[PDB]
């Protein structure tokens, strides 16, 4: 059986606290970066609580956090502060392929305990563009950002993003082409900051997506 701990051990729980509101979800640590959902920044005027197996790190001002936005996708790369303990760089990413067999790798943090698991294997296919890919692995609210991994080679091919109103269809955001290069080539990095959304609804990958279930 494949060992997914090398993946689950890099998962971080993120809590964006701004203007009296909070958005919480998961991310994937890699070197000085944290890969996570773009909607984490529905707001960007507060603090970012980052929890991983290394401990709890808090960013005091999110507005100065350097970010790399992935065109058209619910994915963003965050460059953590210089004094943020770096994650390993063994993780592998790639675009989902036709006939991918996938599983969801998750991690959960409690006050006196913690746990991680890998779901059973299931199938998936592109929704229109391929920005979002449909899947049916059970996902609870709050698990956005959790990695979807290929059963074939252990590569991460996307991060969970959303579900339809009846939770019968789930959707993950696919890793874009040349993603690995993006992580290991500063020249390919487009660092910006202060970016935030202004609406409770967005139109990405051919779907209208709300920040929360109406």
């Amino acid at each position: 059986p494949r060992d997914y701990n090398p993946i689950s051990s890099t998962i971080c729980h993120l809590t964006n606290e701004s203007d009296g509101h909070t958005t919480s979800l998961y991310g994937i640590g890699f070197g000085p970066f944290i890969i996570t959902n773009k909607h984490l920044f529905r707001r960007n005027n507060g603090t970012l609580l980052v929890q991983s197996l290394h401990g709890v790190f808090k960013v005091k001002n999110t507005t100065t956090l350097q970010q790399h936005l992935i065109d058209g996708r619910d994915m963003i790369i965050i460059r953590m502060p210089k004094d943020f303990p770096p994650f390993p760089q063994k993780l592998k990413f790639r675009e989902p392929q036709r006939e991918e067999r996938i599983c969801l790798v998750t991690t959960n943090f409690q006050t006196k305990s913690m746990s991680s698991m890998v779901s059973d294997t299931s199938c998936t296919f592109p929704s229109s563009d391929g920005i979002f890919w449909k899947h049916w692995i059970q996902t609870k609210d709050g698990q956005a950002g959790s990695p979807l991994v290929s059963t074939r080679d252990g590569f991460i091919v996307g991060i969970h993003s959303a579900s339809n109103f009846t939770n019968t269809n789930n959707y993950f955001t696919s890793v874009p082409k040349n993603f690995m290069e993006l992580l290991t080539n500063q020249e390919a990095q487009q660092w910006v900051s202060g970016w935030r959304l202004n609406a409770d609804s967005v139109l990405w990958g051919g779907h209208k997506v709300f920040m929360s279930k109406p």
Partner: peptide, 10 residues
């Protein structure tokens, strides 16, 4: 395509 909602937490 059906409308969706991000499964981020509170």
């Amino acid at each position: 395509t059906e409308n969706l909602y991000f499964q981020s937490g509170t």
